[PDB]
Design a protein around this nucleic acid. Structure first.
Ligand SMILES: [Mg+2]
Ligand SMILES: [Mg+2]
Ligand SMILES: [Mg+2]
Ligand SMILES: [Mg+2]
Ligand SMILES: [Mg+2]
Ligand SMILES: [Mg+2]
Ligand SMILES: [Mg+2]
Ligand SMILES: [Mg+2]
Ligand SMILES: [Mg+2]
Ligand SMILES: [Mg+2]
Ligand SMILES: [Mg+2]
Ligand SMILES: [Mg+2]
Ligand SMILES: [Mg+2]
Ligand SMILES: [Mg+2]
Ligand SMILES: [Mg+2]
Ligand SMILES: [Mg+2]
Ligand SMILES: [Mg+2]
Ligand SMILES: [Mg+2]
Ligand SMILES: [Mg+2]
Ligand SMILES: [Mg+2]
Ligand SMILES: [Mg+2]
Ligand SMILES: [Mg+2]
Ligand SMILES: [Mg+2]
Ligand SMILES: [Mg+2]
Ligand SMILES: [Zn+2]
Lengths: 234, 150, 138, 208
RNA sequence: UAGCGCCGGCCAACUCCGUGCCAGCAGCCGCGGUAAUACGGAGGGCGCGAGCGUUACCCGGAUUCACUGGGCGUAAAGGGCGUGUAGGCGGCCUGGGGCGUCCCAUGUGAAAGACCACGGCUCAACCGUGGGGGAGCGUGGGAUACGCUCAGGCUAGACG
RNA sequence: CCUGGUCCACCCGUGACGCUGAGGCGCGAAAGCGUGGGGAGCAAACCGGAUUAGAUACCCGGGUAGUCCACGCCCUAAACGAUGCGCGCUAGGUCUCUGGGUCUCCUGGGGGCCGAAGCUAACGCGUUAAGCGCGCCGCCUGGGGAGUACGGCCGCAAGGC
RNA sequence: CUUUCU
């Protein structure tokens, strides 16, 4: 778990309209685009990952947040690759902030998967038998990773903070440490533990997260083998 | 433990073809008189509900007041909107010298002696927030020292 | 022209610190440097050093801040919550040693300029003297 | 002059029990005994939440109605404790407790404050010898407060000083039941007094 | 001997009857057109008490003339624009002066009043004694950071 | 043809010669005034048609002052960015006009839009500040009465201050 | 076209 020649992917990203505040983490422009300084990406990785063992080897939870289509898959993978929960499709307003409420939704999900196996499987107009199919359809379309979280997360690993601005904001209001693979286009100051590097690209997203997921297990006595998500990198 | 003073409750209204449609708002202060004060502004269909929601919001918005021998560590002047509140520390036996709003907060704050003055807009709601805000900025020679260490 | 140098400096400082600059330049002058000396001493700034910008002498003023904060707006608490000119040209303000104010119940300071140099208020009071009330800071 | 009129109605309006009668005010009759509610046609109706004013006003009315004193005097006494150094709340109580009529009462010479006033007025009292009939006379540390020799035979003074046999006295006092004397040792402190009063309020009331 | 004002809100103190946008109240908001805690009386209550209430005037509240301590895009408030007199304000370095400014001593700042202490009249009001404070100005001595002044130097303003 | 302002580059010269500006002087849209000239179109007033309950209007047909030039006067305005001038300081992004450069970008001057921080009652403002400061001028202090009265000053008058 | 008041 590490590496410096991660020039193999991440580093520089985003044309040039940046966010002056991400100035520190930038190395320079080239053909137009900025270039994320990896040596720093390192300094941060350490600090960040550390904070994760701590959280991990403590039985602490970490809500993985990835709406960005460019990582939508990698997020399910890695998140599932640990008892960790995730928000994959749309980040519903108040998941963190209005949790006890959005929970009632995860309750319904379960309370439904029941009926669809119980004695009433075939009861009441197939119309309702259809509307309920739907009830689940969507319920499962957004609460498949948010499934787990029985209480508010102890932290949050966000793919692209900017894109995930709301997720972040909420956590903050709740003093829920915020971690995120963010780059040029974002406000670094709103991130507690930063991984400055390509907010886009799978070849990048895949690495950082997976390594971070490993690090979780490599701190939970699971000492698991290679990631099944490298497959989604072609 | 937590005492609860209700500042003001007002009625207010919204319009709909067919009639006025009111909803009440209540400003609530909550403190333990120890050094914890909480301000909350909750609105709702009926007064009771409003007051409750307010207490709820208040407890969820506490401030740590640096009470030093019943008074405050130093003068503060906070401007919240058109409202400006002034806080001056006072010796024992001075009592709480302040308007109904700043007072009510200062008291559940556990403050026993202070000099006060509302300048500018005297809107309870905005004065209230100003007061809270003033307390939030109160510092101790300790913190001041702490901040200028290194 | 640059109407009031001392204000111009306090302001630059006020402005830089407000957006959290690390350092910040100001056209050097003995008098200005002297004030910073107190600024540094009282621990309001990390300190300063004489530099040369485009050939002319300035003073980097290394700013200082509280630590990162929690929840929304992790922006640090200021070390210099305040800083204001008092004596201003076309309105000079002089005080007798008995008329020397006590900034923020002592938690803050005021910088006087006396015939015994530019001392703070405790320094002035101790040395039993008064002078121009340059500025308060807390 | 002083209030004069139904007194237990004050007892009731003030909620708290005030001992403006001595005896009886202990017997199941101070009315605050089954009737702790205010006088008048509305005594038993629900009480609307009192206003910041109300509270301060009432607290003052209480303290004052205790020592049975004209607002005039009460106020000036206050304004005095105000100027004098020391926590005003205390200083003030100390001063009210220095009225001769009060001490005569605090020394069991009299059953109540009112009565003590009359004793002072009808000259049945002494202050280091010389008699003083000014109920508002400031008794101060060291002052011996006797009883008129001539009056020392008065049934009332006897019954009073009799039951006084046994009864202890305030720590800022001391009385010799024998020669019917007593010394004012020191100005009682706030802790020394157990008045059902929040003087922080009384101070605030004169703030307005 | 005990009276007077008040009890819609500001503001402490609520009911019945009478009246019916009348008679009236009223400081402001307002109250009265048949259930009036707002008029009139009564019962009760609140506050003061040999006083209580009114009117008048001053300060306050009023940071509402803002020195302390406010303002001017749309609320009252940028001058139609320029050129420019007086005046106000004045970059960096050094030296002389020591006008401002700061300090010390000293004189003055009467008595009374104000403040503190003790004391006299049974208390207090009132009064006596003692003590401390006091800006301003005069005189002598001192300081020189800042402002002024004078002299010298500089190029970062300005002009060419 | 005569002439003002202004910007850039070079950094070459002077060496604080600076900023603001009560008065003063000047400039100041339109309409308006005086004398002379001009007069196509347009067009207050006005003369007619129509519409209308009426039409001293809107629509239609005519039409004088005027609009034009000269010399002189008037001096006002939603004379507006409804935002005095100067200097320093405080993220950026985008479009544009003009100059320089090693010219697919940097850099100076100007015009716009979105915006950090911040300000604001809100709307909004945000390196073209309404932000942070300093200097100087002007101005405000509830509405109507009223830009009126009186007085003064200016104007030929209207009228202005 | 115009097309008042309550
Ligand atoms: Mg304001
Ligand atoms: Mg009441
Ligand atoms: Mg009736
Ligand atoms: Mg005033
Ligand atoms: Mg002012
Ligand atoms: Mg104002
Ligand atoms: Mg206006
Ligand atoms: Mg203008
Ligand atoms: Mg100078
Ligand atoms: Mg001198
Ligand atoms: Mg005496
Ligand atoms: Mg030219
Ligand atoms: Mg040169
Ligand atoms: Mg030269
Ligand atoms: Mg014309
Ligand atoms: Mg003409
Ligand atoms: Mg025509
Ligand atoms: Mg026509
Ligand atoms: Mg003109
Ligand atoms: Mg530009
Ligand atoms: Mg903002
Ligand atoms: Mg903008
Ligand atoms: Mg008027
Ligand atoms: Mg004339
Ligand atoms: Zn009783």
């Amino acid at each position: 778990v590490k590496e410096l020649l991660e020039a193999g992917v991440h580093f520089g990203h985003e044309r040039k309209r940046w966010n002056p505040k991400f100035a520190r983490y930038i190395y320079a422009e080239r053909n137009g685009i900025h270039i994320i300084d990896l040596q720093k990406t390192m300094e941060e990785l350490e600090r960040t990952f550390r904070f994760i063992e701590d959280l991990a080897m403590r039985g602490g939870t970490i809500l993985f947040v990835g709406t960005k289509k460019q990582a939508q898959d990698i997020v399910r993978m890695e998140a599932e690759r640990a008892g960790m929960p995730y928000v994959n499709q749309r980040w519903l307003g108040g998941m963190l902030t209005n949790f006890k409420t959005i929970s009632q939704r995860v309750h319904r999900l379960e309370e439904l998967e029941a009926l669809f196996a119980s004695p009433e499987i075939e009861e009441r107009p197939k119309k309702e038998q259809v509307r309920l199919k739907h009830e689940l359809e969507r319920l499962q379309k957004y609460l498949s990773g948010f499934r787990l979280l029985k209480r508010l997360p102890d932290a949050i690993f966000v793919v692209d903070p900017t894109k995930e601005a709301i997720a972040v904001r909420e956590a903050r209001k709740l003093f829920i440490p915020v971690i995120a693979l963010a780059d040029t286009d974002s406000d670094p100051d709103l991130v507690d533990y930063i991984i400055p590097g390509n907010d886009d690209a799978i070849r990048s997203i895949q690495l950082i997260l997976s390594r971070a997921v490993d690090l979780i297990i490599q701190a939970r006595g699971g000492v698991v083998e290679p990631s099944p998500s490298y497959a989604l990198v072609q | 433990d937590f005492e609860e003073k209700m500042i003001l409750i007002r009625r207010t209204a919204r319009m709909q073809a067919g009639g006025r449609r009111f909803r009440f708002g209540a400003l609530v202060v909550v403190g333990d008189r120890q050094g914890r004060v909480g301000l909350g502004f909750g609105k709702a269909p009926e007064v009771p509900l409003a007051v409750q929601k307010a207490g709820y919001y208040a407890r969820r918005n506490m401030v740590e007041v640096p009470l030093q021998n019943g008074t405050i560590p130093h003068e503060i002047e906070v401007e919240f909107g058109a409202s400006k509140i002034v806080l001056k520390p006072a010796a024992p036996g001075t009592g709480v010298i302040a308007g109904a709003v700043p007072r009510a907060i200062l008291e559940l704050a556990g403050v026993t002696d202070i000099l006060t003055k509302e300048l500018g807009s005297r809107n309870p709601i905005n004065i209230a927030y100003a007061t809270m805000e003033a307390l939030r900025q109160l510092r101790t020679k300790a913190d001041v020292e702490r901040l200028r260490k290194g | 022209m640059l109407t009031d140098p001392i204000a111009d400096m306090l302001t630059r400082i006020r402005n830089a610190t407000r957006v959290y600059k690390e350092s910040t330049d100001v056209p050097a002058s003995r008098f200005k440097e002297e004030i910073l000396r107190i600024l540094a001493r009282e621990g309001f700034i990390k300190g300063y050093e004489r530099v040369d910008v485009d050939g002319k002498p300035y003073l980097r003023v290394y700013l200082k801040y509280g630590p990162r904060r929690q929840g929304p707006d992790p922006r640090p608490e200021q070390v210099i919550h305040h800083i204001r000119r008092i004596s201003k040209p076309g309105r000079r303000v002089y005080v007798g040693v008995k008329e020397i104010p006590r900034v923020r119940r002592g938690l803050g300071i005021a910088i006087l300029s006396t015939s015994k140099g530019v001392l703070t208020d405790r320094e002035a009071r101790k040395l039993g003297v008064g002078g121009e009330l340059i500025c308060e800071v807390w | 002059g002083r209030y004069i009129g139904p007194v237990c109605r004050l007892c009731r309006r003030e909620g708290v029990k005030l001992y403006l009668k001595g005896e009886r005010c202990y017997s199941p009759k101070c009315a605050m005994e089954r009737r702790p509610y205010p006088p008048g046609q509305h005594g038993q109706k629900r009480a609307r939440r009192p206003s910041d004013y109300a509270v301060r006003l009432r607290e003052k009315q209480k303290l004052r109605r205790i020592y049975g004193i004209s607002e005039r005097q009460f106020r000036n006494l206050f304004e005095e404790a105000s100027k004098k150094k020391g926590v005003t709340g205390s200083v003030f109580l100390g001063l009210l407790e220095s009225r001769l009529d009060n001490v005569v009462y605090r020394l069991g010479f009299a059953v109540s404050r009112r009565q003590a006033r009359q004793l002072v007025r009808h000259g049945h009292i002494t202050v280091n010898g010389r008699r003083v009939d000014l109920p508002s006379y400031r008794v101060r540390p060291g002052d011996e407060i006797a009883v008129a020799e001539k009056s020392r035979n008065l049934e009332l003074i006897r019954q009073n000083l009799e039951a006084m046999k046994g009864r202890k006295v305030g720590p800022w006092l001391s009385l010799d039941v024998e020669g019917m004397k007593g010394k004012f040792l020191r100005l009682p402190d706030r802790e020394d007094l157990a008045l059902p009063v929040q003087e922080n309020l009384v101070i605030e009331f004169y703030s307005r």
